[PDB]
Design a protein around this ligand. Structure first.
Ligand SMILES: [Mg+2]
Ligand SMILES: [Mg+2]
Ligand SMILES: [Mg+2]
Ligand SMILES: [Mg+2]
Ligand SMILES: [Mg+2]
Ligand SMILES: [Mg+2]
Ligand SMILES: [Mg+2]
Ligand SMILES: [Mg+2]
Ligand SMILES: [Mg+2]
Ligand SMILES: [Mg+2]
Ligand SMILES: [Mg+2]
Ligand SMILES: [Zn+2]
Lengths: 214, 140, 24, 64, 49, 102
RNA sequence: CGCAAGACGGACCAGAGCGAAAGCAUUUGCCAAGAAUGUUUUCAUUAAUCAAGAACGAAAGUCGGAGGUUCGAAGACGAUCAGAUACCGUCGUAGUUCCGACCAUAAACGAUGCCGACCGGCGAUGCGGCGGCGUUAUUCCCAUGACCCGCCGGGCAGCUUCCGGGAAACCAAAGUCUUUGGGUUCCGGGGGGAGUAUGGUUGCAAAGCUGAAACUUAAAGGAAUUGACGGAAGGGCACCACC
């Protein structure tokens, strides 16, 4: 008979301060009672949100995962948990008569956050191309994948998780793959399709607070 | 308004967002709706909970009646914007959504409910789980 | 009949022939 | 809230439809924004060149 | 045990070599009685795993 | 006798092709022998889009499509009326039906 | 939200590639192997096809050890039926997966032996190589990548043709055949009985290879034509159809 939502209470989930829209949305949870505390009921929770509302004037076909780590009263803060593309984009990306390229790498950033990377790429037909299809020889696919592997690992090593996300929202890393792999085979839509998180180093609160603060 | 304590402290201009997991497969239709996380569900209705005919569970008639009950429950609570997550049976089974996907979507729109991004979350495999048909298939 | 069911029926007929012959 | 009433003049008719000939298509305009015209699906005899009422401008129209 | 006599075994005895009672025995059976399959959750050819 | 030069399949230089299962009856057919349908239909029932756009939180929001590749056996295919029996001279033609653009 | 397990590698994926066939599709590395191309390199007839003999051989099946997620013979049940030992539904053993050892069968098909020569045309495609306006990548130029126009060789094919052939369907091979002979294996002789019996041999078994006769029958078959029909599609028509 008792309405559970009378027992529940609403928090607000806040993205990292490096994001211009800090407000993600509002969630609900039961009030802290018994051995249950709304603190640890709130941590370990994900909030998928499209990049269009995360930034001001960027595309909508990219989404982020945003695991929650603390509760600050009404505030319950989150950080980057994983990025992916809208499946409608992905299925529209694939097409016949051109070869899709896939690669992955598992790299450790300088702060102890190790990431699993997924990148996709497709070959372009030229403006004057008259052959119906545009394929790549197997060895070409190897070497464009090998270079897309090494620039992906080289960029994460030199920098940290803070500097990896700021340059990830524009997906400017995808622009410098095709800017240098064009000389070996012209690709036209290359994106990092997915990123997945595997380990969280020691839960350093000072690093989380300061990225969420000044 | 006021409700009172149910639903968060909101202003006039802004709105609160939810997600509707619309599982409109064949043989049934689900218009589940949850919070933005996905796990603290608010109102769960299915086509079968309304039609008593045991065969119209995926019919369009069952589809919008279930959705409006979710729709009516949303305004009772306070949730007013909804991202929509379509999904079919998926897996090794069929990928096209059933006949109740559209009728339930129409009901939300005619119930005056803001709709955000629309995505389909049909579980697609990487060529796994050999399909239950046998070699010669369903020879009906 | 289907030929393959003829081939199957005759195979099971030969098996019965071999059993009786081994008996005798 | 609801758009008020409007009137529509019918230009050349684009044949019957509805799979039994119950409805026809008319390609009407609003005699005020006479440049902007839409195709409409109506039932009954047309009188190509007459005027007909309209509540909502852009409802729908499918191609035959 | 079926080849023994009723003194040496619960299964012993009889004009035909047979158990004469379920070979599954309860776990709390007294020592001297729990012979055969002890507290068996199932019997048979064990097909499937 | 031989109804078609190729035997109903696009197999010319290889020995074996992977069997794939019909999406309607779940019968496995060779991949080259299947009837492929690529539907790029919208998930919105275009007859009922205006309210969705009217009820959208955003104004210039682009509606998403639905891209599903669809496989049939020829037993299910002609039953579903996706392919049809044709005359002998018309049967040996591989140009797809027109897109009906105008 | 995680977790664990075992299978399977979608969409890219094509009348595209590779392999003697069976067959082969996530990334990376290692191991040996192969065609084609290029060669004013080498040997100099070393070659073609091949009884006996040998290597490999889908799936199912067998034996031993792991694993058993999904499907699923057998089996159970619910339906359907007049009946329903089936189709459909829910379970579900063997099996499906891996390792090792057997079997050697498929519509194992291109229902088309291999090597060689000749006999029309056209547009493509994959690989290699040889050229050419130009675009492009970056660069500071050249190669080199991607594209365009050709070409040479080897492949998978396709379109067309009164080359010719064929019973025709059709085939640029199934042509160069009464104007009958390039070389060389296998193999058929009306339909059944019958791939049966028996003998031999292989196999753990299932079964494999070799393989008749008695007797019975006037046809059985192949390609095309017409009609009839269809619980096959498509246009048209009708207030004894509808609106
Ligand atoms: Mg049928
Ligand atoms: Mg005794
Ligand atoms: Mg006793
Ligand atoms: Mg006894
Ligand atoms: Mg007794
Ligand atoms: Mg095998
Ligand atoms: Mg099952
Ligand atoms: Mg086994
Ligand atoms: Mg074969
Ligand atoms: Mg010869
Ligand atoms: Mg004979
Ligand atoms: Zn089918």
């Amino acid at each position: 008979v008792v309405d559970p939502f009378s027992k529940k209470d609403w928090y607000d989930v806040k993205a990292p301060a490096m994001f211009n829209i800090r407000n993600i949305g509002k969630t609900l949870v039961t009030r802290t009672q018994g051995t249950k505390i709304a603190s640890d009921g709130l941590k370990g929770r994900v909030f998928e949100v499209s990049l269009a509302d995360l930034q001001n004037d960027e595309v909508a076909f990219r989404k982020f995962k945003l695991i929650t780590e603390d509760v600050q009263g009404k505030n319950c803060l989150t950080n980057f948990h994983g990025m992916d593309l809208t499946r409608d984009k992905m299925c529209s990306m694939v097409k016949k008569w051109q070869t899709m390229i896939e690669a992955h790498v598992d790299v450790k950033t300088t702060d102890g956050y190790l990431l699993r990377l997924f990148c996709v790429g497709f070959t372009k037909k030229r403006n004057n191309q008259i052959r119906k299809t545009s394929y790549a020889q197997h060895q070409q696919v190897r070497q464009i994948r090998k270079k897309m592997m090494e620039i992906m690992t080289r960029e994460v090593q030199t920098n940290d998780l803070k500097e990896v996300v700021n340059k990830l929202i524009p997906d400017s890393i995808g622009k410098d793959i095709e800017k240098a792999c064009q000389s070996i085979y012209p690709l036209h839509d290359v994106f990092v399709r997915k990123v997945k998180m595997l380990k969280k180093p020691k839960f350093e609160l000072g690093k989380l607070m300061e990225l969420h603060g000044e | 308004e006021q409700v009172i304590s149910l639903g968060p402290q909101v202003a006039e201009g802004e709105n609160v967002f939810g997600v509707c997991h619309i599982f409109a497969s064949f043989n049934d239709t689900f218009v589940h709706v949850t919070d933005l996380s996905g796990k603290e569900t608010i109102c769960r209705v299915t086509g079968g909970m309304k039609v008593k005919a045991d065969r119209d569970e995926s019919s369009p008639y069952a589809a919008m009646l279930a959705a409006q009950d979710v729709a009516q429950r949303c305004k009772e609570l306070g949730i007013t914007a909804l991202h929509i997550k379509l999904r079919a049976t998926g897996g090794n089974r069929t990928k096209t959504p059933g006949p109740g996907a559209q009728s339930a979507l129409r009901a939300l729109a005619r119930s005056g409910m803001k709709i955000g991004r629309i995505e389909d979350v049909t579980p697609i495999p990487s060529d796994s789980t050999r399909r239950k048909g046998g070699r010669r298939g369903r020879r009906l | 009949m289907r030929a393959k069911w003829r081939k199957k029926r005759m195979r099971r007929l030969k098996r019965k022939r071999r059993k009786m012959r081994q008996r005798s | 809230r609801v758009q008020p009433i409007k009137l529509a003049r019918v230009t050349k008719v684009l044949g019957r439809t509805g799979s039994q000939g119950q409805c026809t298509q008319v390609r009407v305009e609003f005699m005020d924004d006479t440049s902007r015209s839409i195709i409409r699906n109506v039932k009954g005899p047309v009188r190509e060149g007459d005027v007909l009422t309209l509540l909502e401008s852009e409802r729908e129209a499918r191609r035959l | 045990g079926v080849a023994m006599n009723p003194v040496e075994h619960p299964f012993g005895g009889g004009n035909h070599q047979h158990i004469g009672k379920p070979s599954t025995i309860r776990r709390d059976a007294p020592a001297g009685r729990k012979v055969g399959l002890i507290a068996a959750r199932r019997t048979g050819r064990l097909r499937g795993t | 006798t031989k109804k078609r030069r190729n035997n109903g399949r696009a197999k010319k230089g290889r020995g074996h092709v992977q069997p794939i299962r019909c999406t309607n009856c779940a019968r496995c057919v060779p991949k080259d022998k299947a009837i492929k349908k690529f539907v790029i239909r919208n998930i919105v029932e275009a007859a009922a889009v205006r309210d969705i756009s009217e009820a959208s939180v955003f104004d210039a929001y682009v509606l998403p499509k639905l891209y599903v590749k669809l496989h049939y056996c020829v037993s299910c295919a002609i039953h579903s009326k996706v392919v049809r029996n044709r005359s002998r001279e018309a049967r040996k033609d591989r140009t797809p039906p027109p897109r009906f653009r105008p």
